[PDB]
């Protein structure tokens, strides 16, 4: 679990969005596994606007942060799960690192700010949904 709180927005994994997220929906994209909902309180986070390919992410299944080298946002095949049929997920970045079910929502940051959130994993891999192209989060 986890979310990004920026301005009056809450960014979560679409597959983990709550009834309240859907009742305050701003934007969602199943192909990216993202959902943004509106908040009343002002957020605590700021978003990176950069091309970093190294950073640090939070891994809840280890209660620890790990450094990672990750690929540029791209269209990647993701096998069927209880949440989605087998499909291509867009704007996904892969890296070698630990992840398991429960770790979605962990934040990836570089020196400029938040880059994205954990969205996929498997056998020593971790995938992050990029949010750096969502310029409207800042306004
Ligand atoms: N974005 C998606 O389509 C997600 C939806 C939830 C299931 N998916 C996974 O990859 C899980 C969650 C992280 C993780 C780590 C290790 C193994 C795994 O199967 C998983 C795919
Ligand atoms: Zn950066």
Curated annotation (Swiss-Prot):
> Where in the full protein does the shown chain start and end, and how long is the full protein?
869 to 1007 of 2193
Q: Where is the active site?
A: 15, 33, 104
The name this protein carries in UniProt is Protease 2A
**Which residues make up the binding site for Zn(2+) 1?**
50, 52, 110, 112
* Function summary: Cysteine protease that cleaves viral polyprotein and specific host proteins. It is responsible for the autocatalytic cleavage between the P1 and P2 regions, which is the first cleavage occurring in the polyprotein. Also cleaves the host translation initiation factor EIF4G1, in order to shut down the capped cellular mRNA translation. Inhibits the host nucleus-cytoplasm protein and RNA trafficking by cleaving host members of the nuclear pores. Counteracts stress granule formation probably by antagonizing its assembly or promoting its dissassembly.
**Catalytic activities:** Selective cleavage of Tyr-|-Gly bond in the picornavirus polyprotein
Share what the entry says about its subunit structure, partners included: Homodimer.
């Amino acid at each position: 679990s986890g979310a990004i709180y920026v301005g009056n927005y809450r960014v979560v994994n679409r597959h983990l969005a709550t009834h309240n997220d859907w009742a305050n929906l701003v934007w969602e994209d199943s192909s990216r596994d993202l959902l943004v909902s509106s908040t009343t309180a002002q957020g605590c986070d700021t978003i990176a606007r950069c091309d970093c390919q190294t950073g640090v992410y939070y891994c809840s299944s280890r209660r620890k942060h790990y450094p990672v080298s990750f690929s540029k946002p791209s269209l990647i095949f993701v096998e069927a799960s209880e949440y989605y049929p087998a499909r291509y997920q867009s704007h996904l970045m892969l890296a070698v690192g630990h992840s398991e079910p429960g770790d979605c929502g962990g934040i990836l940051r570089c020196q400029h700010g938040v880059v994205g959130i954990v969205s996929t994993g498997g056998n020593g891999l971790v995938g992050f949904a990029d949010v750096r192209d969502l310029l409207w989060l800042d306004e």
